[PDB]
């Protein structure tokens, strides 16, 4: 059963604002392949931004995003 | 960011034993709906032994389960 439902991801934090839990939707990083994982929230997908990371990922502006 | 993300699931909890979060392997249905999402533990998925939870209107024993 998924923790929090479908607007509230417990399992997650976007690696832009930090916010958490993620409210809303959230988007997940294909091609960054680290162990932790690289998501970030709607409002972090939808403004242009320069965060590589919050853990040391190596996320680049061509890497592809899909939402959970 | 994801919590966890190894041996530990903070995006999801046992349908079986309601766990929460699942520690060590996570068990997730494909069939059931992306939206309710169906997810078990590793001592619920291996145990043969019925629990009040173990099927559903929705959950049903031709549903296929992948490893996460
Ligand atoms: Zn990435
Ligand atoms: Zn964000
Ligand atoms: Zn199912
Ligand atoms: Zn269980």
Do not use: M
Request: net charge negative.
């Amino acid at each position: 059963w998924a923790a929090g439902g479908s607007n509230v991801h417990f399992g997650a934090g976007c690696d832009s604002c930090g916010v958490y839990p993620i409210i809303g939707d959230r988007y997940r990083c294909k091609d960054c392949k680290e162990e932790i994982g690289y998501d970030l929230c709607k409002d972090c997908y939808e403004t242009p931004s320069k965060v590589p990371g919050r853990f040391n990922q190596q996320h680049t502006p061509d890497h592809r995003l899909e939402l959970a």
